[PDB]
Amino acid sequence: DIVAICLNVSNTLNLKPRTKVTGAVIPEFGAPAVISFTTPATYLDTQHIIELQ
Amino acid sequence: GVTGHYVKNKGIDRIVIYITPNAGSAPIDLKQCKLFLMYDGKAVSLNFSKYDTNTVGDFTNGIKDIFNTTVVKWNNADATSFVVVALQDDDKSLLTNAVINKGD
Numbered sequence: 632d633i634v635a636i637c638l639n640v641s642n643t644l645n646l647k648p649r650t651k652v653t654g655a656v657i658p659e660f661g662a663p664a665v666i667s668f669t670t671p672a673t674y675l676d677t678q679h680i681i682e683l684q
Numbered sequence: 685g686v687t688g689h690y691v692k693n694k695g696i697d698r699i700v701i702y703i704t705p706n707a708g709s710a711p712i713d714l715k716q717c718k719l720f721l722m723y724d725g726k727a728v729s730l731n732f733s734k735y736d737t738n739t740v741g742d743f744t745n746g747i748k749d750i751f752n753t754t755v756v757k758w759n760n761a762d763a764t765s766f767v768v769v770a771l772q773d774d775d776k777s778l779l780t781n782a783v784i785n786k787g788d
């Protein structure tokens with residue numbers, strides 16, 4: 632299976648450029664998935680969807 | 685390329701340096717770049733500064749003369765900064781947050 636966890640971060644975390652984001656999805660049992668990315672140096676208006684990790 | 689303006693009996697007063705990205709380069713955030721220059725007694729670093737009211741002077745559609753003061757607005761070129769004039773940019777990247785990408 633593949634499934635997408637959807638999070639709206641607009642007011643909660645302030646993801647401007649050059650910003651490190653760290654985290655995990657932790658299940659009831661078993662090993663966590665590790666989220667780890669740094670947002671790009673430049674965001675362009677021609678490319679509103681970005682691949683982060 | 686580099687080009688420059690001579691005031692009579694004085695010497696070169698101002699210079700304009702034309703810059704472009706290399707093939708395949710990822711986009712460069714011009715407003716963080718620093719320019720180091722050496723000459724007969726001084727080694728100076730200059731930092732980006734905004735054109736009048738806008739991030740980059742929009743001359744995508746041509747300039748009568750790059751050195752005429754009233755057209756071009758040289759005034760923010762202080763002794764410690766530079767300003768950027770956008771000469772070709774399809775995607776509006778220069779014009780908006782000052783990012784050079786392919787073909788600019």
Ligand SMILES: [Ca+2]
Nearest residue numbers: 773775777788
């Ligand atoms: Ca561009």
